[PDB]
Design a protein around this ligand. Structure first.
Ligand SMILES: CCC1=C(C)/C(=C/C2=NC(=C\c3[nH]c(/C=C4\NC(=O)[C@H](C)[C@H]4CC)c(C)c3CCC(=O)O)/C(CCC(=O)O)=C2C)NC1=O
Ligand SMILES: CCC1=C(C)/C(=C/C2=NC(=C\c3[nH]c(/C=C4\NC(=O)[C@H](C)[C@H]4CC)c(C)c3CCC(=O)O)/C(CCC(=O)O)=C2C)NC1=O
Ligand SMILES: CCC1=C(C)/C(=C/C2=NC(=C\c3[nH]c(/C=C4\NC(=O)[C@H](C)[C@H]4CC)c(C)c3CCC(=O)O)/C(CCC(=O)O)=C2C)NC1=O
Ligand SMILES: CCC1=C(C)/C(=C/C2=NC(=C\c3[nH]c(/C=C4\NC(=O)[C@H](C)[C@H]4CC)c(C)c3CCC(=O)O)/C(CCC(=O)O)=C2C)NC1=O
Ligand SMILES: CCC1=C(C)/C(=C/C2=NC(=C\c3[nH]c(/C=C4\NC(=O)[C@H](C)[C@H]4CC)c(C)c3CCC(=O)O)/C(CCC(=O)O)=C2C)NC1=O
Ligand SMILES: CCC1=C(C)/C(=C/C2=NC(=C\c3[nH]c(/C=C4\NC(=O)[C@H](C)[C@H]4CC)c(C)c3CCC(=O)O)/C(CCC(=O)O)=C2C)NC1=O
Ligand SMILES: CCC1=C(C)/C(=C/C2=NC(=C\c3[nH]c(/C=C4\NC(=O)[C@H](C)[C@H]4CC)c(C)c3CCC(=O)O)/C(CCC(=O)O)=C2C)NC1=O
Ligand SMILES: CCC1=C(C)/C(=C/C2=NC(=C\c3[nH]c(/C=C4\NC(=O)[C@H](C)[C@H]4CC)c(C)c3CCC(=O)O)/C(CCC(=O)O)=C2C)NC1=O
Lengths: 162, 172, 515
């Protein structure tokens, strides 16, 4: 996964050279930023259920029509899959927070996203609404830097969806 | 109606001696956490309409025989009675939460309540279900970390859970 | 089409559905619990005293009928439901009430101090019975706490009977509910701001029906019925009289209650509750979370995202950066691009400092040649030839040049024939230009990017064997294409290419049948 340490190692390895001061300072920045990111991930994990339920209902609020019979948001299975997908997004965002890089989101959600959504007729706007929700509440669940890392990762996912 | 302090005092009086150092440490710790307790009682008090609307909506979704002709919440009179009972039981749960004891809830609210409902033809299991739903909404509101200093309050959540669960068990 | 039903039955169906709004739908059905609005008060027999009889209020001026009805209600409440004879009727008290000297409250005070009240509810009673009766008749409720009984017993013992009656009538509760003008009524049959859980049950215990009364002339005497329950903080009895058994028989309040099975279900082999646990997981909880958590259960395939790339040993060869070298570049970018170029184009084989091309690096540094032209120079060099051409067969050279310059394996035997013929008729340099001037090379690497291994991902036009053939060509990240192996530099894909496969597919198709 593309993280600070991993890109450091990969760039040094592609040039066949040891780890120098530049890369060690990048690693130092990662190790220092770990504390805000890890406790932001802690906060996001502790509140996963409320976040996911609020996100699903926010999607149903901004897209009322999907709830009606005959289209995507109708049925117990479809809404369980909505909840599962939003939980997937939250899970990989917390993963990226912990790993200090967009790696987990890049490799698990963003690689192959458009093809899969197109094949299954899934609107990226639903997930954008859910992630804007999660963004809004992660604003008040987090303070200081932790809010900052959480929102960089959430906005990275949103940008990937658009 | 007695609080945690009067409970300790009664237990000490029964054996008939002073409150021990462990008892006084317990009670001083309770008073130290009483600020968070006040926050919890405020959370229950400011969000009662929200909690009871949510509980009523969930309850009449799960149990439609209540709100349809013949049901025990059918006309406006019995529907209003149902929402009133929800208000009352939430009120006594918040009282007990402030007291730190469930003596006010048991003694003043839930003591003849199953007998009343049985005499009126009211499903006590539905009332217990309503209390459970209302506990869930209340627990959503209690955990809210907005407008209030952040810190651990797990003991308070567990205690409010016991008060609602005791209400449900007493009714059903 | 002939009629399928007689018209009378069609009329009956139409008029049955006409009396519903919406006819017959699933949403508009009657409640299985068939309770009328008046179900509770009717089955309890408290309809008259709780909802139907009006609250009688008497003010300073009034007509004859208002006065007489007020007196009837007063005597029927304060004296229990007991017959008060004409000789017992208080005349001066109601003359003072008629004048306006006393209020209805003062009249209640007088009556509760009269020998009628004392003879009925005091002189042949315990004090517990008296306090119950006085709470019921004077305050409209039942005692809530044993402290009330202690208070009233001590008040009568110290200050007398009239102080007790005044404690009842002067109480703020009495004035809150009745003031000075309305007759006291039974009031705990409807919820009020100060009620308690036990109050309804205890008042029901104290109330014996419209045709029942609190009389000392029972053969058992005037006995307390709440003396044991108030002390133990128990609810009251809710057993109603016998004439109410026929009332609303067909209601089903306990509709949600589940009938038990005749025999508990067991599971003998894996323990004896897996059916009960299965039934609690199936029905007790809503379908949504059931599916939600079933969706996120881990799979029996415990496969990470890198699984499959790790199996073929191509994680690094897939994830390494694509080196693109523009016309202007820095020294670090140039040296790193040189490292990448020599690692790929020479097959991860060591090139010593003496073998490195300085003039070609200089031409690339100036911009005279592109990365593509540098690659072309390198593959024409004695390094590349001596490693991949001179000690090899042409099959090995062709598969190896495909791998190194296109990042993919040969897709068929036609490529082998084409390249062998091209080298044989035109020579090595033309054969290198065939790779480097190919549309494939320019579409994927195109004059500026170092070649990379393309065939670990599906390429359009690939033959489903080029993946397997690149895997068989690739020897991991630490493998090389050296000519210094013990056997030598030998081909790998000759039989697979010429055959076009393994030759076991027909027998695989047979095996996927019967056996
Ligand atoms: C016996 C006499 C009786 C009446 C009259 C009655 C009305 C009534 N309608 C209700 C629901 C409702 N009723 C409405 C009516 C609205 N729908 C909109 O299209 C209109 C603008 C508007 C009507 C003119 C709506 C929206 C709800 C749902 C409110 C909710 O979310 O709970 C409810 C809440 C319980 C439930 O969920 O069913 C009651 C008590 N109940 C009774 O027992
Ligand atoms: C201070 C403590 C206290 C409580 C809590 C209390 C409850 C109480 N609920 C009552 C009726 C009722 N209570 C309910 C509510 C129930 N039925 C619905 O189906 C729901 C399932 C459920 C509520 C969630 C209903 C519908 C009635 C009216 C029943 C009838 O009149 O037939 C009554 C009878 C008097 C009246 O109608 O106002 C009492 C005394 N009384 C007290 O002194
Ligand atoms: C008007 C009545 C009243 C209120 C409302 C009140 C709130 C109150 N909450 C406080 C801190 C706090 N409040 C809480 C409670 C929160 N912790 C979690 O977020 C929960 C969601 C929630 C409670 C369940 C906590 C943990 C503290 C910090 C510990 C402390 O300072 O006592 C403080 C101390 C000053 C401060 O640190 O900000 C006050 C005065 N005090 C009062 O006399
Ligand atoms: C809902 C309307 C209503 C009814 C029906 C009613 C009946 C009634 N009859 C009573 C007494 C009585 N009832 C009777 C009548 C019977 N004994 C004789 O043998 C006759 C055969 C028979 C009458 C035909 C007698 C004699 C008493 C007095 C019992 C006694 O003092 O020992 C009492 C007790 C009142 C008291 O003594 O203070 C009531 C409540 N009261 C009501 O408010
Ligand atoms: C008019 C006739 C009449 C009488 C006499 C009567 C007795 C009576 N005794 C009572 C309590 C009591 N009575 C006693 C006295 C007993 N306990 C002591 O150990 C002794 C063994 C014994 C006395 C020699 C005590 C201690 C209480 C308080 C009980 C308690 O609070 O648990 C009470 C309840 C009021 C209260 O709690 O203060 C009554 C009504 N009731 C009546 O209607
Ligand atoms: C993943 C990174 C990576 C590694 C690790 C790597 C190892 C590596 N060592 C090689 C050759 C060699 N390696 C050795 C080293 C051995 N000689 C013994 O005396 C020593 C005990 C031992 C070394 C400590 C020698 C002597 C050769 C040359 C073999 C020959 O010329 O015939 C080769 C073949 C390239 C060539 O021969 O030109 C590779 C691929 N290559 C890589 O890209
Ligand atoms: C540079 C060293 C080298 C050599 C010499 C070499 C031989 C060689 N001969 C080939 C084909 C062939 N070779 C022959 C020759 C046979 N025809 C008659 O039967 C004769 C008995 C016999 C020759 C006297 C034929 C007919 C083919 C056509 C393949 C086919 O049957 O489809 C092929 C496959 C590519 C193609 O079809 O052109 C190679 C690689 N490979 C090498 O790397
Ligand atoms: C021209 C003919 C041709 C075909 C058909 C072909 C298939 C093919 N499928 C691949 C991967 C894959 N193929 C599948 C599809 C399978 N796995 C799922 O579970 C399903 C059970 C099932 C589809 C119904 C999956 C999941 C992968 C990725 C496996 C991995 O990357 O580890 C790959 C590896 C390269 C890549 O991932 O892009 C090839 C080459 N190649 C060819 O040259």
């Amino acid at each position: 996964s593309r993280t600070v340490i991993t890109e450091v190692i990969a760039t040094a390895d592609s040039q066949g050279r040891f780890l120098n001061s530049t890369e060690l300072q990048a690693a130092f920045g990662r190790f220092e930023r770990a504390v805000p990111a890890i406790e932001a991930a802690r906060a996001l994990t502790k509140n996963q259920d409320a976040l996911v339920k609020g996100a699903v209902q926010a999607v149903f609020k901004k897209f009322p029509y999907v709830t009606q019979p005959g289209e995507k948001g109708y049925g117990d299975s479809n809404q369980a899959k909505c909840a599962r997908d939003i939980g997937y997004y939250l899970r990989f965002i917390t993963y990226s927070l912990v790993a200090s890089g967009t790696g987990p989101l890049d490799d698990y959600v963003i690689a192959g996203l458009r093809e899969v959504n197109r094949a299954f007729n899934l609107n990226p706007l639903w997930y954008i609404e859910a992630l804007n929700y999660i963004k809004g509440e992660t604003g008040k669940l987090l303070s200081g830097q932790s809010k900052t890392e959480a929102l960089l990762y959430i906005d990275h996912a949103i940008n990937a969806l658009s | 109606m007695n609080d945690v302090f009067t409970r300790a005092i009664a237990q000490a009086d029964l054996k008939g001696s002073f409150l021990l150092e462990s008892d006084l440490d317990k009670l001083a710790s309770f008073a130290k956490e009483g600020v968070k307790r006040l926050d919890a009682v405020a959370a229950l008090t400011n969000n009662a309409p929200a909690i009871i609307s949510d509980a009523a909506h969930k309850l009449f979704a799960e149990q439609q025989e209540l709100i349809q002709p013949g049901g025990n919440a059918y006309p406006h009179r019995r529907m209003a009675a149902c929402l009133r009972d929800m208000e009352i039981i939430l009120r006594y749960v918040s009282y007990a939460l402030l007291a730190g004891d469930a003596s006010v809830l048991d003694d003043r609210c839930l003591n003849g309540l199953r007998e009343t409902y049985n005499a009126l033809g009211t499903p006590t299991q539905s009332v217990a279900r309503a209390v459970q739903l209302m506990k869930d909404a209340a627990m959503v509101h209690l955990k809210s970390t907005a407008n209030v200093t952040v810190g651990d309050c797990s003991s308070l959540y567990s205690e409010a859970a016991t008060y609602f669960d005791k209400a449900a068990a007493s009714i059903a | 089409m002939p009629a399928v039903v007689a018209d009378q039955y069609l009329a009956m169906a139409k008029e049955l559905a006409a009396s519903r709004f919406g006819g017959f739908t699933k949403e508009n059905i009657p409640s299985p619990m068939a309770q009328p609005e008046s179900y509770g008060r009717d089955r309890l027999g408290i309809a008259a005293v709780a909802t139907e009889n009006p609250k009688v209020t008497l003010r300073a001026p009034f007509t004859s009928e208002e006065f007489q009805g007020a007196l009837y209600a007063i005597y029927r409440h304060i004296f229990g439901n007991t017959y008060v004879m004409e000789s017992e009727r208080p005349t001066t008290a109601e003359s003072q009430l008629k004048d306006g000297r006393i209020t209805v409250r003062g009249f209640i005070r007088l009556l509760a101090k009269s020998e009628v009240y004392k003879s009925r509810f005091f002189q042949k009673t315990s004090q517990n019975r008296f306090i119950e009766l006085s709470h019921k008749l004077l305050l409209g409720r039942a005692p809530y706490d044993q402290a009330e009984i202690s208070y009233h017993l001590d008040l009568w013992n110290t200050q007398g009977y009239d102080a007790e009656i005044d404690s009842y009538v002067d109480s703020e509760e009495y004035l809150d509910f009745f003031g000075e003008d309305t007759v006291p009524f039974l009031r705990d049959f409807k919820y009020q701001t100060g009620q308690q859980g036990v109050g309804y049950s205890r008042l029901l215990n104290l109330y014996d029906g419209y045709a029942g009364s609190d009389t000392d002339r029972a053969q058992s005497g005037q006995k307390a019925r709440l003396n044991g329950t108030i002390a133990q903080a128990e609810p009251g009895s809710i057993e109603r009289p016998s004439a109410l058994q026929d009332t609303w028989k067909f209601a089903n309040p306990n509709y949600r209650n589940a009938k038990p099975p005749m025999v508990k279900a067991l599971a003998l082999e894996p323990v004896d509750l897996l059916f009960l646990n299965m039934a609690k997981d199936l029905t007790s909880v809503s379908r949504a979370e059931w599916l939600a958590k079933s969706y996120t259960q881990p799979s029996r395939y415990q496969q990470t995202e890198t699984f499959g790339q790790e199996r073929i040993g191509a994680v690094g060869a897939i994830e390494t950066p694509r080196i693109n070298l523009r016309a202007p570049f820095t020294s670090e970018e140039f040296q790193g691009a040189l490292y990448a170029i020599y690692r790929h184009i020479f097959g991860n084989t060591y090139v010593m400092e003496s073998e490195r091309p300085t003039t070609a690096e200089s031409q690339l540094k100036d911009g005279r040649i592109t990365v593509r032209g540098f690659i072309r120079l390198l593959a024409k060099s004695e390094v590349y030839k001596s490693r991949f051409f001179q000690k090899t067969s042409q099959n090995r050279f062709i598969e190896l040049s495909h791998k190194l310059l296109l990042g993919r394996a040969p897709y068929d035997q036609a490529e082998i024939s084409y390249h062998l013929d091209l080298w044989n008729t035109q020579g090595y340099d033309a054969e290198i230009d065939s790779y480097v001037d190919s549309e494939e090379y320019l579409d994927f690497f195109g004059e500026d990017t170092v070649p990379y291994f393309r065939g670990f991902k599906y390429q359009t036009g690939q033959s489903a064997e080029g993946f397997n053939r690149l895997v068989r060509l690739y020897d991991g990240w630490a493998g090389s294409d050296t000519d210094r192996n013990v056997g030598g530099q030998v081909a790998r894909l000759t039989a697979n290419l010429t055959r076009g496969g393994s030759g076991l597919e027909p027998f695989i198709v047979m095996a996927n049948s019967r056996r």
